[PDB]
């Protein structure tokens, strides 16, 4: 990733051992689950195309997630291209050329290159363009590999509240308020109604806590 | 977060994998007993917004105490804005716009607007006002699922005093005197009675020590 | 805690995650036996008030020995006051207000307060002095759950005198000469009375070595 | 590896045990999948010919892939002499040699020669070079251990379409579109037939999502 | 331990966790072995007397060796004091006192006395003084605990002599050439006296490869 | 080891824990294989002959192996002694004496000496030059203990071709082209007669791949 130094001044440094094997162990521990994503923003913080890339080919099976998200990739690329078309000239010493949808992804950019956008003044983050563009892509698969539809997640007739709770919005969030209440167990139901309309989490946990 | 470096200026650097595996696996291993509030709060020193929502995303289940905990940021951040309504009006060079109650959740903020505000001088932290909401809601998360009453903490009749009042102020530290006394069992309540009404801890365990 | 970085000023810098994690598992795997204090005075080297609060409050359970340490740390705060009555008057500036016993305990002082006790020039060691309090309650502790007494330590009729001397002075340690020539089996006492008086612990194992 | 200090010199140092750790592991787990490839790369950043080799002689077993490591090595050094053939005359002084093919791969050329090569200006980058060798040889030993052809992935009768599509792509990517669709059972191939020639893979496997 | 940072000034800084546990561990895992004392040596790298105590603390158990340790470091600082009298007076501005025997032990010096020594120039080591005095005494405990003598190192009949040369010295370590011969069995005791008396190991150990 | 910091000055800094728990595990795991010579000359990067003598001290067992390794390192230093003897005389100011055999090993030179050398300009590498003898004397080791030789690793008549040839060059890398036919089974051999004496590896490998 590209970090600050003792001086003020950007530098590239190596991935690490400890954020490479980070990134291939919480996939292979949970897949696309919804606080994988976040994991991944975090692991690769400051990093360039190329680390970007590096988590991605690290990432053995799950190959149909990373075809989409190559595919993703693409898509988002070419949007690029559409909005920025590089013009032709020779570039002024001391600068950098305009990136290519390719070259955000890593594709057709060197190190040194990637180097010289995100450390430029101003910058372009060729890094956060192309972690926004991957992130994107991930949060596709997550939505599509997510098994249970929010509409199935019932309270059943015993299951505690907080339970229930802890698997309704864990649903939601791999889907990405009145629902809560009418999936609710009839006897929790029956509280939760004359409990309000503008009731809390806290309060309608309380209020069917048993 | 924001640190120091080598030079007297607060810089910022990438949260570490260990800070980001430290977190998910005290959670795991934990839940919300009281010992993990002040985890999360080293394990965020220095954390910017963004680093404090990083930690909460990378936290899979609990997700009815994560929804509770959005719930209480929600309201922490409506009194911000009230009690500092933004001022409308071109931000001078060099300098950093008023932040809203969204902006210190990191919610309408940008990484670089955090590292203005918690780097300016005087600073603006954002992060320690974040992490003082989240701490705050996290605490009414513990309080909520704490299990047992302190009323029903009772010294068995062959229990060891010191396991008792392991149990009582395990159980008081969840909830957050004389109490102890009056649920000790019959034998160790009449020591403790002709004690003194104010034995130290351990002058009262001393006593009961069996 | 606050170290001096490549520069000759001492500068805090965030408590990290290997020691947050080594000092609550030497409390889970050890307890309170003799060689936990010194793990906790070399884990909190350099720490603040802040940070020692920190260490005590990430321990989960032993709730009974923690209580009494916070009865400890108000009996040196209270007697901390006695001895330094802070003067009032307005405190000049680039100056430090005089702490109080809970401004050592890290209870109404804040974080940068406590740095600048701790980089004054002269400094006012608030984190050694608070560690010196907890040292002493934990010795409390310690001293307290010994479990068995040195007049009760004997060696058997074919215990090794190894073995014997090993739980001699671990027993010793706990509770903080003669009485190990006295605790020998008949065998082992013969040969140490014709050893001598002026004997070392190396002489008396070699001459009951079996 | 040769990295940048505080300064902005390029500075050899010492390979981490962390790192050559991670490399023997992930051989001794993987073996030559794919994603060894770029976990090699990763482990491998900045590093100077002499790093490169230990990397490989640490290596335990799979001694016929290292062996036909050394003859693409062999080939690549020997097709960098014929481009690049050595001129005779004393080097000037705060100068660098012109490296052979050997020097390049560490054979020949001392480590404060590979220094002078990857911290000259310009550069010789010999480390990229013979990563770039190395790398190349590695691809050429996950072909040849690829057990499965890409004609021989069918998809099972009850085989989900998701899953097929996972060993598709990983057999793919070993081996180095539209037989995706010749591939798939019956009942996904008539979905996949009336959805289009230009469907996306997130469109087809939505498809056949059973 | 005081150690050089960026500058050239020696610097104290804190034990680390890391070195904490590895001294733990080697005593829990080898005990008293041979090889225990050069990992002692190692970990305890510029340690000032205030670590080296702190190494020894936190061992638990083999308190019989631990206060035999004791008994020689009393020995060495006895013997310090004796070549080294200190010498009254007033202690000039910006130097330090004489150590006696119990500030190089770390009982009477405090923290700042023992970085004024080692960091003073001409520096004072009284960590390398106390280290000296320690390893002493754990050589004594490893000669002490050592179980089986040298002249009870007998090849089998049937023993490998790899084996046997592995017990031999093994052993010979522990308790601190011509018997390697006399010890062998009477097939290899054979070959090697028509060997020749100036025979090496590789040559002894060839010439009885069975 | 010997480090270059954040200036352009080569520093001593003690060795890691880290580094010394590898060079531990990798002898205990591996034994004398030999893909633990490179593991030492990696781990001992930048070592001083301190550091080389700590690392072959902290091995229990295998003494043996470690005797012959101090023979050998005592041959390799008389023949560093009669190449360079010691011309008698006052050291300059500022400067270094000569070293010896002894000195290079580290048995008659203190720690400052050995960076006195190694930090010379010009250097005297006693680390490399050290090192290089204790590579020599392992490597000795290793084709010692090579159990199996080349002239008995055949292919057996249904094992596969690449499963031979991974224990023909691990066979061949212990003990330190043609013969790899000679000793194919009957099937693979009338194969590999008909291909041509000129073949590569991998076309060989390819042929006899069944
Ligand atoms: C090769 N490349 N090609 C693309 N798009 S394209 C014309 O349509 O094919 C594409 C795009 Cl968009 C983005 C980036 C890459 N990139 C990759 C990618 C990263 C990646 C992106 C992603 F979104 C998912 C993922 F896992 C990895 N690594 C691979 O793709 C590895 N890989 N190989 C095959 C093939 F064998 F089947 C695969 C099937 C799934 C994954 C496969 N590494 C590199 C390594 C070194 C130097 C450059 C690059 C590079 O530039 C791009
Ligand atoms: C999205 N956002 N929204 C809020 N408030 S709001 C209008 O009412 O919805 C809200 C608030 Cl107050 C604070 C911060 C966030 N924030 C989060 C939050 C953090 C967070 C806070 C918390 F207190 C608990 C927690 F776990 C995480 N991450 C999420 O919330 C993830 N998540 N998603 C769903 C949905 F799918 F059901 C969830 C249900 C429980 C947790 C859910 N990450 C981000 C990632 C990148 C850039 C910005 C952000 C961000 O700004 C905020
Ligand atoms: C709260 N506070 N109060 C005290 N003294 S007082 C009026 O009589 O109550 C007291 C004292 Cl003397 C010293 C320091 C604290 N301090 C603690 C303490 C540390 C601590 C000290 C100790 F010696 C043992 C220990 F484990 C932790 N953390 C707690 O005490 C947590 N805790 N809570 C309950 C209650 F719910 F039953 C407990 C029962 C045993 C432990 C409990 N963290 C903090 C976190 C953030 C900002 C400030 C603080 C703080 O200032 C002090
Ligand atoms: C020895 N050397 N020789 C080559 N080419 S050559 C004339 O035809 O033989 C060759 C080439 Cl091309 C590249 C580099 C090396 N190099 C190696 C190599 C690295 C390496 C490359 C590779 F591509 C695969 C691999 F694993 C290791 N280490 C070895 O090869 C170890 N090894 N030894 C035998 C023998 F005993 F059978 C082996 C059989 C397979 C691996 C073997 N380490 C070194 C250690 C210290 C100082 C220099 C060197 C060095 O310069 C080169
Ligand atoms: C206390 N002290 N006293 C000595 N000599 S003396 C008059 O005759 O008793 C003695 C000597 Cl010579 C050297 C150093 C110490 N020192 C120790 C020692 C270290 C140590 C040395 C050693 F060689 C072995 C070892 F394990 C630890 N820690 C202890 O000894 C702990 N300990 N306590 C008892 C008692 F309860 F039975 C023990 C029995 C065996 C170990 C015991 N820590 C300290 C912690 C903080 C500030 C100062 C100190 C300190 O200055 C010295
Ligand atoms: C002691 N010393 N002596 C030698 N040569 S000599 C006259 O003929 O005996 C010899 C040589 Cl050539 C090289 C270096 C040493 N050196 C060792 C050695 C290293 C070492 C070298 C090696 F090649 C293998 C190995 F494992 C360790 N450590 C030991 O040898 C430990 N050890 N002790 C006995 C005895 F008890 F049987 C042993 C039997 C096998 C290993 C034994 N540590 C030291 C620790 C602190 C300060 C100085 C030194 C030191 O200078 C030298
Ligand atoms: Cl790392
Ligand atoms: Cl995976
Ligand atoms: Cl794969
Ligand atoms: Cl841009
Ligand atoms: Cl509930
Ligand atoms: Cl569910
Ligand atoms: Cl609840
Ligand atoms: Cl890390
Ligand atoms: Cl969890
Ligand atoms: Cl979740
Ligand atoms: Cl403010
Ligand atoms: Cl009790
Ligand atoms: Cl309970
Ligand atoms: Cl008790
Ligand atoms: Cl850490
Ligand atoms: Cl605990
Ligand atoms: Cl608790
Ligand atoms: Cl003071
Ligand atoms: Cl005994
Ligand atoms: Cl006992
Ligand atoms: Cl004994
Ligand atoms: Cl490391
Ligand atoms: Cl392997
Ligand atoms: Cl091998
Ligand atoms: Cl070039
Ligand atoms: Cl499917
Ligand atoms: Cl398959
Ligand atoms: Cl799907
Ligand atoms: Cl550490
Ligand atoms: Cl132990
Ligand atoms: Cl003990
Ligand atoms: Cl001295
Ligand atoms: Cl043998
Ligand atoms: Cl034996
Ligand atoms: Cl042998
Ligand atoms: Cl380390
Ligand atoms: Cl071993
Ligand atoms: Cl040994
Ligand atoms: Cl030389
Ligand atoms: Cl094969
Ligand atoms: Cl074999
Ligand atoms: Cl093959």
Same mark, same amino acid.
Not at 3 to 26: D, E, F, Y
Not at 56 to 61: E, I
Not at 106 to 119: K, P, R, V
Not at 165 to 176: I, N
């Given at each position: =990733?590209?970090?600050?130094?003792?001086?003020?001044?950007?530098?590239?440094?190596?991935?690490?051992?400890?954020?490479?094997?980070?990134?291939?162990?919480?996939?292979?521990?949970?897949?696309?689950?919804?606080? $994988?994503? =976040?994991?991944?923003?975090?692991?690769?913080?400051?990093?360039? =195309?190329? /680390?970007?890339?590096?988590?991605?080919?690290? $990432?053995?099976?799950?190959?149909?997630?990373?075809?989409?998200?190559?595919?993703?990739?693409?898509? +988002?690329?070419?949007?690029?291209?559409?909005?920025?078309? $590089?013009?032709? %000239?020779?570039?002024?010493?001391?600068?950098?050329?305009?990136?290519?949808?390719?070259?955000?992804?890593?594709?057709?950019?060197?190190?040194?290159?990637?180097?010289?956008?995100?450390?430029?003044? =101003?910058?372009?983050? $060729?890094?956060?363009? @192309?972690?926004?563009?991957?992130?994107?892509?991930?949060?596709?698969?997550?939505?599509? @590999?997510?098994?249970?539809?929010?509409? /199935? &997640?019932?309270?059943?007739?015993?299951?505690?509240?907080?339970?229930?709770? /802890?698997?309704?919005?864990?649903?939601?969030?791999?889907?990405? +308020?009145?629902?809560?209440?009418?999936?609710?167990?009839? /006897?929790?139901?029956? &509280?939760?109604?004359?409990?309000?309309? %503008?009731?809390?989490? +806290?309060?309608?946990?309380?209020?069917?806590?048993?």
């Amino acid at each position: =990733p590209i970090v600050q130094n003792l001086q003020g001044q950007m530098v590239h440094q190596c991935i690490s051992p400890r954020t490479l094997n980070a990134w291939v162990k919480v996939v292979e521990e949970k897949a696309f689950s919804p606080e $994988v994503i =976040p994991m991944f923003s975090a692991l690769s913080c400051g990093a360039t =195309p190329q /680390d970007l890339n590096t988590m991605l080919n690290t $990432v053995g099976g799950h190959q149909a997630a990373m075809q989409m998200l190559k595919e993703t990739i693409n898509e +988002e690329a070419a949007e690029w291209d559409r909005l920025h078309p $590089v013009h032709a %000239g020779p570039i002024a010493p001391g600068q950098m050329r305009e990136p290519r949808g390719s070259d955000i992804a890593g594709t057709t950019s060197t190190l040194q290159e990637q180097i010289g956008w995100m450390t430029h003044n =101003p910058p372009i983050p $060729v890094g956060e363009i @192309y972690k926004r563009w991957i992130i994107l892509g991930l949060n596709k698969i997550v939505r599509m @590999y997510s098994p249970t539809s929010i509409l /199935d &997640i019932r309270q059943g007739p015993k299951e505690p509240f907080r339970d229930y709770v /802890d698997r309704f919005y864990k649903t939601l969030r791999a889907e990405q +308020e009145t629902l809560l209440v009418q999936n609710a167990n009839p /006897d929790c139901k029956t &509280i939760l109604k004359a409990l309000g309309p %503008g009731a809390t989490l +806290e309060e309608m946990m309380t209020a069917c806590q048993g």
